[PDB]
Task: inverse folding
């Protein structure tokens, strides 16, 4: 399932627990950017997905403040879990930095991450 | 400032509490889409923003399953809160539906929602 | 309807001609960013839209090189034209800067621009 | 360089010519979606890129109307060309469908395509 440790193509680490209620909790350690150590993540997933070979929709957020650094930014990942023996979480993400109003047009980066489950 | 009841340009209702250390917890009621009533949301926000006039970064997720319906999809909103006389949350969002691998290319809608505390 | 001079919420000026068979050709002058004066744009639009009240899909690209400056970046706008008494072009855009491979993760900004023919 | 034939992970075909003036022209054949045969594309690229090992920024548009079908939609790809012997064009894209105003919130799909040059 979703619960476990995952790594993406950048070398970031995603440790997550999926709760019976649809909750995602855990920590994220980013390999790049204005980040060090682990950050809290929270999110949600479809706890009763279709079983017709569709992925399980999910998303989560990290605000890039922990007890060692603050980037004044937040990323959300939106995507789907694809189960089986080579499980993947395939995502697109939005990274919004706090900006002044004049600079809001350049506040948000977009990208895509693929996570592979370890073990 | 983030804590409260917010409404976007579609008429959706976003009820949220900002916990002191960065949690966002609340409910979302979508006015459009395959949705009815309230859905659980969780997210995070910068609980110590910059003091230079910059907004407060945040994000949250809704999985579109509740006791009424399950759309087999999830939306994340990423944005910033802008305080002031008319506080606003300006976001972009990603709505991913569960799909087959083959159809993953058409799994994700993108858009932008603006929230204020002004009731329609 | 698409042909004309448009302005977005940032004050940028988008001057475009819609050719009969789907071409968009014009210039873009950005009011923000690493840009000055006009830049060439090209794009495409649906030259036979649906007749059910739907907007007209379109998109265009600017590479941010002209005789004045080169930002080593390019923006694409994807959206729809909505005709009517106050015609509008509603878009989302992707601004990709050239980066190293390692830094590609932070290469692309996303946003949304609304255009009308109303001069600021 | 950019001029040539490219294929992406979906099996789509991108035939492009890069002009000295920064123009991109060519045709696109989509392997998926509401599409058949070739469609016109136009775009732009940075004709004087940095040479410090950065990619070359570019973008292009296809409106999904040709003389055999009309999807009432348009895709833009924004990305960068990475030269060398295994040249790539790495993109993110936005596919906007014409909708009614009430349905505009669901008008736009986002994704990512990687193109590999043939030959
Ligand atoms: O630079 C910042 O504002 C904080 C760190 C951001 C890292 C981003 S989140 C999206 C992408 N995926 C990763 O694992 N790292 C980058
Ligand atoms: O149709 C679905 O899959 C679930 C409902 C989706 C509603 C979307 S979330 C983004 C946008 N903002 C809203 O308030 N509603 C729509
Ligand atoms: O800074 C750059 O790399 C070039 C100028 C970018 C301006 C961007 S394009 C998207 C948005 N809409 C505008 O009118 N201006 C900004
Ligand atoms: O379905 C449509 O509206 C027209 C065809 C869209 C195909 C899309 S464009 C983005 C992605 N990359 C491809 O090569 N095909 C899909």
Result:
């Amino acid at each position: 399932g979703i619960t476990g440790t995952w790594y993406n193509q950048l070398g970031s680490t995603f440790i997550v627990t999926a709760g019976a209620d649809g909750a995602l909790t855990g920590t994220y350690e980013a390999a790049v950017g204005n980040a060090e150590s682990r950050y809290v993540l929270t999110g949600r997933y479809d706890s009763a997905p279709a079983t017709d070979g569709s992925g399980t929709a999910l998303g989560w957020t990290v605000a890039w403040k922990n007890n060692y650094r603050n980037a004044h930014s937040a990323t959300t990942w939106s995507g789907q879990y694809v189960g089986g023996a080579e499980a993947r979480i395939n995502t697109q993400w939005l990274l919004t930095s706090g900006t002044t109003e004049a600079n809001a047009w350049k506040s948000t980066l977009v990208g895509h991450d693929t996570f592979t489950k370890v073990k």
Notes: Chain A touches chain D at residues 92, 110-112 (CB under 8 Å). DSSP finds no helices and eight strands in chain A. Strands of chain A lie at 4-8, 13-18, 23-29, 38-45, 56-65, 70-82, 88-97, 108-118. Residues 1-119 of chain A form a domain with the Lipocalin fold (CATH 2.40.128.30).
